[PDB]
Coordinates of all heavy atoms in Angstrom, one line a residue:
Chain A
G186 N 46.4 -2.4 16.4 CA 47.9 -2.8 16.8 C 47.8 -3.2 18.2 O 48.9 -3.3 18.9
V187 N 46.7 -3.6 18.8 CA 46.7 -4.2 20.1 C 47.3 -5.4 20.3 O 48.1 -5.5 21.3 CB 45.1 -4.3 20.6 CG1 44.5 -2.9 20.7 CG2 44.4 -5.3 19.8
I188 N 47.2 -6.4 19.5 CA 48.1 -7.7 19.3 C 48.4 -7.9 17.9 O 47.5 -8.2 17.1 CB 47.3 -8.8 20.1 CG1 45.9 -8.8 19.6 CG2 47.6 -8.7 21.6 CD1 45.3 -10.1 20.1
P189 N 49.6 -8.2 17.6 CA 50.0 -8.6 16.3 C 49.6 -10.0 16.1 O 49.5 -10.9 17.0 CB 51.6 -8.4 16.2 CG 52.0 -8.6 17.7 CD 50.9 -8.1 18.6
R190 N 49.5 -10.4 14.9 CA 49.1 -11.8 14.5 C 50.3 -12.7 14.8 O 51.5 -12.3 15.3 CB 48.9 -11.9 13.0 CG 47.6 -11.4 12.6 CD 47.5 -11.4 11.1 NE 46.1 -11.0 10.6 CZ 45.7 -9.6 10.6 NH1 46.6 -8.8 10.9 NH2 44.5 -9.3 10.2
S191 N 50.3 -14.0 14.7 CA 50.9 -15.3 15.0 C 51.1 -15.6 16.5 O 51.7 -16.6 16.7 CB 52.6 -14.9 14.6 OG 53.1 -14.1 15.5
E192 N 50.2 -14.9 17.3 CA 49.9 -15.5 18.6 C 48.4 -15.3 18.8 O 47.9 -14.3 18.7 CB 50.8 -14.9 19.7 CG 50.5 -13.4 20.0 CD 51.2 -12.5 19.1 OE1 51.6 -13.0 18.0 OE2 51.3 -11.2 19.4
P193 N 47.7 -16.3 19.3 CA 46.3 -16.2 19.5 C 45.8 -15.3 20.6 O 46.6 -14.8 21.4 CB 45.8 -17.6 19.8 CG 46.9 -18.5 19.4 CD 48.2 -17.6 19.6
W194 N 44.5 -14.9 20.6 CA 44.0 -14.0 21.5 C 43.9 -14.8 23.0 O 43.5 -15.9 23.0 CB 42.5 -13.6 21.2 CG 42.1 -12.4 21.9 CD1 42.8 -11.6 22.6 CD2 40.8 -11.9 21.8 NE1 42.1 -10.6 23.1 CE2 40.7 -10.7 22.8 CE3 39.5 -12.4 21.4 CZ2 39.6 -10.0 23.0 CZ3 38.4 -11.5 21.7 CH2 38.5 -10.5 22.5
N195 N 44.4 -14.1 23.9 CA 44.4 -14.9 25.2 C 43.1 -15.2 25.8 O 43.1 -16.1 26.6 CB 45.5 -14.0 26.2 CG 44.7 -12.7 26.7 OD1 43.9 -12.2 26.1 ND2 45.1 -12.3 27.9
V196 N 42.2 -14.3 25.7 CA 40.9 -14.5 26.3 C 40.2 -15.7 25.5 O 40.6 -16.0 24.3 CB 39.9 -13.3 26.2 CG1 39.6 -13.1 24.8 CG2 38.6 -13.6 27.1
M197 N 39.4 -16.4 26.2 CA 38.8 -17.7 25.6 C 37.4 -17.6 25.3 O 36.7 -16.8 26.0 CB 39.2 -18.8 26.6 CG 38.9 -18.5 28.0 SD 39.5 -19.8 29.2 CE 38.7 -21.3 28.5
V198 N 36.9 -18.4 24.4 CA 35.5 -18.7 24.4 C 35.0 -19.3 25.6 O 35.8 -19.8 26.5 CB 35.3 -19.5 23.2 CG1 33.7 -19.6 22.7 CG2 36.0 -19.1 21.9
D199 N 33.7 -19.3 25.9 CA 32.9 -19.6 27.1 C 32.9 -18.2 27.8 O 32.2 -18.2 28.9 CB 33.5 -20.7 28.0 CG 33.3 -22.0 27.3 OD1 32.3 -22.1 26.6 OD2 34.1 -22.9 27.5

Side-chain angles (χ1 to χ4, degrees):
Chain A
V187 297
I188 44 167
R190 286 175 177 79
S191 71
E192 69 275 16
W194 198 17
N195 72 335
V196 67
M197 47 189 306
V198 193
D199 291 331

